[PDB]
Amino acid sequence: VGAXAXVXWXWXWXWX
Amino acid sequence: VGAXAXVXWXWXWXWX
């Protein structure tokens, strides 16, 4: 269903 | 900034 795998791009929210 | 590396969990939106 839908596209790709999961929800988002990467992990969490931000960088650090 | 924030926490982690990216946004959410994975790559995209679903399970294609």
Q: Which two tokens stand for residue B15?
A: 């399970």
Closest Cβ–Cβ partner in A3, A5, A8 for B6: A8
Q: How was this structure determined?
A: X-ray
Q: Which two tokens stand for residue A12?
A: 């969490």
* Contact present, B16 and A1 (Cβ < 8 Å): yes
Resolution (A): 1.1
* Contact present, A12 and B5 (Cβ < 8 Å): yes
- Give the separation between CA B5 and CA A13, rounded to whole angstroms: 7
* Contact present, A12 and B4 (Cβ < 8 Å): yes
The alpha-carbon gap from A3 to the nearest alpha carbon of chain B, in Å, equals: 4
The candidate with the shortest Cα–Cα distance to B8, out of A13, A16, A2, A14, is A13
DSSP state letters, A1-16: -EEEEEEEEEEEEEE-
List A15's β-bridge partners, or say none. Answer: B5
